[PDB]
C-alpha cells in the first residue's frame, strides 16, 4: 500500500497467552447464545 514506514511494533507473533483469547471467544459465544440477542 501507500504506507511502508518505520516499525509500528508491539505487534509480534509469539502469543504465549492463547487460552486468554479462548476465554474471549468463549464469552463471545455465550453472549451470542444468550436468551436476549436482538439480532437483524
Amino acid at each position: 500500500e501507500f504506507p511502508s514506514i518505520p516499525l509500528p511494533i508491539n505487534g509480534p507473533i509469539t502469543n504465549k497467552e492463547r487460552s486468554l483469547a479462548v476465554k474471549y471467544i468463549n464469552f463471545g459465544k455465550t453472549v451470542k447464545d444468550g436468551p436476549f440477542y436482538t439480532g437483524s
Binding site: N15, A21, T38
Partner: protein, 537 residues
C-alpha cells in the same frame, strides 16, 4: 478508486465506532442502532428513538432497552416538568461498554488472585460463575443453584463465593449505578437549597458555601454504600458455617477492578530503577493495599464543577488528607508486608529513595505510596516509550528535551547532542502532526506574518495525552471491525460446524483462519494494557 486500505471510515466515526463495534459482536444489530443514536444525540426518550431510527417501532425499541439494561449499558433517568407529565429518559453507559470491552481480562485477574488452593478449583467453580455474572448481568444465588441437579457439593461454591466478595469485585446490584452522575449531584444541589428559609443575604448568596458543603457531606455516603458493606457481609447463623445472604442478587464492581489493574502499570514502573526480588516485595506490599485505595476519579468532580478555583485547589489538597488519614492503608510496617526483617526494611528504604514518586512521604518510619503525585510521572514515563518504540529514539530525546526546559528556542536543540538541520527540523514536522510540539510564533510586524517571525516550541500537556488516547481507541475500533468482516467468510463454515459436535483444503481454510482470529485478540489485550494509563488520572 480501489479503496482496500480502509479509507472509508477515516472521517465518519471516531469515539463512537468503538462503542458500536463492541455491541455489534455481542448484542446483534438492533442494539447497535440505538447505541449509535444515544451517543450521537444525547438524552432522548423512547418515542424520540422511534422517530429517529426509521426502521424500528415501540415494540422493537423497548425490547432492546431491557437487553441493554441487563448489561447496564443504558442509564435510567426519570424526570418531570414544572407542569407535570413525568416520563423516562435514557443515557448511554460507558462502564457497561467497558465491561463488554475487557470481558476476559476480568477473568484473567480474578483467577490469579487466590491463595495456595491452586489448579483444583479455578476451572469450573469460580470461572463458570464469574463469566455468568459478566454475561447475564445481575445474578442471585437461588436462581443459579437450580441449574445443577442433586447438589452434593453445594457448599463448595459458597466458600469461593464468600471469599470473592470479601476483598472486592462482587457487590450489591445497581440501585444507584443506573442513576447518572450529574443528576445525582443536581438533585442533591437543589433538595438542600430549597429547605433553607429566608434569611440575611451576607454578600447575597452565602449558601454556595453552606449547602454545597452539605452536598459534599451527603455525597460521601452515596458512593460508600456500593463498597465493603456489613449488610451483605459478616452474617453468622446459629450452629452453622459463616455465609453471606443469598437472597438478594449481586453484580460485579468496575471500581476495585481498575485500581487492581493500575498495579500492573505500577509493577511495570517497578521494573525500572530496581531489580526483581525488590520489585517482588513491592509487588506484594502493593497487592496488600488494593481494595482500600483511593479510586480513579470520583464522581464529585467528574461533573457539576464550574471551576471554582478555591474548590478546585482544595479538592487536590483534601485528597492528600484522605491519603494520609486511612483506616489502615498507611500502616505499611514490617509485620504487615512480610507475612501476607531488616533486609526488607533496607529494600523499602531503597524504594523510599528510588526518586520516582512512590513509597515516599515517611516521617515516623511507616511508609505510604503517593497515588496522587505519581500520575503525571506514570502518564509521561509510558508516553515517551511509544514515540521511542514506534517513531524513533532520536524523536524521544527531542520530545524529552522540549520538556527538559519550558519553551525551547530555535538554536538551543542543535546545541545539544546533535548537529543542526539534518534531522532536528525533520522530526519536528513528524511530531507537530501528533499534538506533541505546539508551535507558537511571534512576529515583529503588524499583520502577524511568518517571514518576519520567530518560532517558540512549548510542549503543551493534555493535548498529547488526549490525541494518543483517541488514537488508541480508534485502533481498537479498527481491530474489531476487521475481525467481524472475516467472519462473513465463515457463516457457511462455523454455523455448519454444529451437526458433528475431510477435504484438506479446509485445513488451509478452517484451521488457518482460527489463529488469524486468535492473534487479533492476542494484540487487543496489549492495546488494552497500553490504553488504560490515559484514563487513570
Amino acid at each position: 478508486v480501489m479503496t482496500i486500505s480502509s479509507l472509508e471510515q477515516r472521517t465518519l466515526n471516531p469515539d463512537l465506532f468503538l462503542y458500536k463495534e463492541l455491541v455489534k459482536a455481542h448484542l446483534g444489530e438492533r442494539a447497535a442502532s440505538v447505541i449509535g443514536m444515544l451517543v450521537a444525540l444525547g438524552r432522548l426518550s423512547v418515542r424520540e428513538l422511534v422517530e429517529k431510527i426509521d426502521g424500528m417501532d415501540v415494540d422493537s425499541v423497548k425490547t432492546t432497552l431491557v437487553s441493554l439494561t441487563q448489561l447496564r449499558c443504558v442509564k435510567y433517568l426519570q424526570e418531570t416538568a414544572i407542569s407535570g407529565k413525568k416520563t423516562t429518559y435514557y443515557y448511554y453507559n460507558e462502564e457497561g461498554i467497558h465491561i463488554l470491552l475487557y470481558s476476559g481480562l476480568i477473568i484473567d485477574e480474578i483467577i490469579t488472585q487466590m491463595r495456595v488452593n491452586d489448579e483444583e478449583e479455578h476451572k469450573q467453580l469460580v470461572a463458570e460463575i464469574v463469566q455468568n455474572v459478566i454475561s447475564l448481568g445481575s445474578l442471585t444465588v437461588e436462581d443459579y443453584l437450580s441449574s445443577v441437579t442433586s447438589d452434593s457439593m453445594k457448599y463448595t461454591i459458597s466458600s469461593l463465593f464468600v471469599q470473592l466478595c470479601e476483598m472486592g469485585y462482587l457487590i450489591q446490584i445497581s440501585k444507584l449505578h443506573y442513576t447518572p452522575i450529574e443528576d445525582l449531584w443536581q438533585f442533591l444541589y437543589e433538595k438542600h437549597y430549597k429547605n433553607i428559609p429566608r434569611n440575611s443575604p451576607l454578600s447575597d448568596l452565602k449558601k454556595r458555601s453552606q449547602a454545597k458543603m452539605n452536598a459534599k457531606t451527603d455525597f460521601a455516603k452515596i458512593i460508600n454504600k456500593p463498597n465493603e458493606l456489613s449488610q451483605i457481609l459478616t452474617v453468622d447463623p446459629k450452629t452453622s458455617l459463616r455465609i453471606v445472604k443469598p437472597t438478594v442478587s449481586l453484580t460485579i464492581n468496575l471500581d476495585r477492578f481498575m485500581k487492581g489493574r493500575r498495579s500492573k502499570q505500577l509493577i511495570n514502573l517497578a521494573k525500572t530503577r530496581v531489580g526483581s526480588v525488590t520489585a517482588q516485595v513491592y509487588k506484594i506490599a502493593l497487592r496488600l493495599t488494593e481494595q482500600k485505595s483511593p479510586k480513579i476519579r470520583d464522581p464529585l468532580t467528574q461533573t457539576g464543577l464550574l471551576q471554582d478555583l478555591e474548590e478546585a485547589k482544595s479538592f487536590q489538597d483534601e485528597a492528600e488528607l484522605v491519603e494520609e488519614k486511612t483506616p489502615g492503608l498507611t500502616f505499611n510496617a514490617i509485620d504487615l508486608a512480610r507475612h501476607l526483617a531488616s533486609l526488607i526494611n533496607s529494600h523499602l528504604k531503597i524504594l523510599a529513595s528510588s526518586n520516582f514518586p512512590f513509597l515516599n512521604e515517611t516521617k515516623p518510619g511507616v511508609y505510604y505510596v503517593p497515588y496522587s503525585k505519581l500520575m503525571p510521572v506514570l502518564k509521561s514515563s509510558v508516553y515517551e516509550y511509544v514515540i521511542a518504540s514506534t517513531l524513533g529514539p532520536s524523536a524521544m530525546r527531542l520530545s524529552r528535551c522540549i520538556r527538559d526546559n519550558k519553551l525551547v528556542s530555535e538554536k538551543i536543540i542543535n546545541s545539544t547532542a546533535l548537529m543542526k538541520e539534518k534531522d532536528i527540523r525533520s522530526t519536528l514536522a513528524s511530531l507537530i502532526r501528533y499534538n506533541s510540539v505546539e508551535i507558537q510564533e511571534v512576529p515583529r510586524t503588524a499583520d502577524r506574518s511568518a517571514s518576519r517571525a520567530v518560532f517558540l516550541f512549548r510542549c503543551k500537556e493534555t493535548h498529547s495525552y488526549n490525541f494518543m488516547r483517541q488514537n488508541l481507541e480508534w485502533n481498537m475500533a479498527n481491530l474489531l471491525f476487521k475481525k467481524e468482516k472475516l467472519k462473513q467468510e465463515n457463516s457457511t463454515l462455523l454455523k455448519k460446524a454444529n451437526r458433528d459436535d475431510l477435504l484438506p483444503s479446509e485445513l488451509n481454510q478452517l484451521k488457518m483462519v482460527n489463529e488469524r482470529e486468535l492473534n487479533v485478540f492476542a494484540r487487543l489485550s496489549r492495546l488494552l494494557s497500553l490504553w488504560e494509563v490515559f484514563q487513570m488520572a
